[PDB]
Design a protein around this ligand. Structure first.
Ligand SMILES: Nc1nc2c(ncn2[C@@H]2O[C@H](CO)[C@@H](O)[C@H]2O)c(=O)[nH]1
Ligand SMILES: [Zn+2]
Ligand SMILES: [Zn+2]
Lengths: 156, 157
């Protein structure tokens, strides 16, 4: 179940990087096993540096459910959310976060050294009440191999 | 220069709460004393909780300049940017943030305790690089007054 939606997010990351919409990142917002939004990074397509997978997914889910809170929903992120996207997940009142890969896997292929203190519990001012699960096992392995596969696809 | 655009961000906050767009928060993005974007909170207008004033100004400025980085621009925020908007400011690579009122002013009237460590200098993983100026004197008084003036004329979020 967690595996299913995290896998869908990984596939979204691959789809988005293939169509040039943005980086290899995907997010899926679900409401009691019903998928509300299935998105990926749209930074290049939208010319929007805020259009990460999770922000895009939140925007879609909110417009679709006609409310600015997603407290009955859960978000699946193929990669550990950034400071911006974790702030967005907090503001959206999403009740649970499941992320597949560590930020270090994206930093390994050259992404910003940009990690959210509130997610890792290393803040003085910003804390978090949100349920956070780092995926393990098969889903985590699949999620982490995304960045090396993407770097290989564009090496030459 | 600073006071002008800070006052414009505050005016955007007032205009946004009056027309019910969202909360008393404004943002103004400038490129060498030329406004490229002037925005306020649109969370209620757009049904988008990410549509704070700063994120809205970033989206609009990036559409106006046709690029995803604003390295040659500065941003003026009526209130201290939250973690989400400060992360957005980092991703946008704005070279300078000037902000009006400390976040405690917004919290006192009913908003969440939701403060950016990397802005206040207490970040471990998120380390900013941009110049950050907190307003003093008249700009500080104006931005602080925003929250008493608009105490309950808007829908909390
Ligand atoms: N800086 C800023 N804070 C906002 C905005 N909208 C709501 N807030 C809240 O204001 C408080 C102080 O940043 C936090 O609880 C935020 O969630 C906005 O548009 N800009
Ligand atoms: Zn992000
Ligand atoms: Zn904000």
């Amino acid at each position: 179940s967690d595996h299913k939606f995290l896998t869908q997010a990984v596939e979204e990351a691959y789809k988005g990087v293939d169509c040039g919409d943005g980086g290899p990142f995907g997010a899926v917002i679900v409401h009691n096993n019903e998928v509300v939004a299935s998105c990926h990074n749209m930074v290049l397509k939208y010319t929007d540096p805020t259009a990460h997978a999770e922000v895009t997914a939140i925007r879609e889910a909110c417009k679709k459910l006609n409310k600015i809170e997603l407290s009955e929903c859960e978000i699946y992120a193929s990669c550990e959310p950034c400071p911006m996207c974790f702030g967005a997940i907090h503001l959206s009142r999403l009740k649970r976060l499941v992320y597949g890969a560590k930020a270090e896997a994206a930093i390994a292929i050259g992404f910003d050294d940009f990690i959210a203190d509130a997610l890792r519990g290393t803040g003085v001012y910003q804390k978090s009440s949100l349920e956070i699960k780092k995926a393990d096992g098969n889903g985590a392995a699949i999620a982490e191999q995304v960045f090396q596969n993407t770097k290989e696809k564009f090496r030459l």
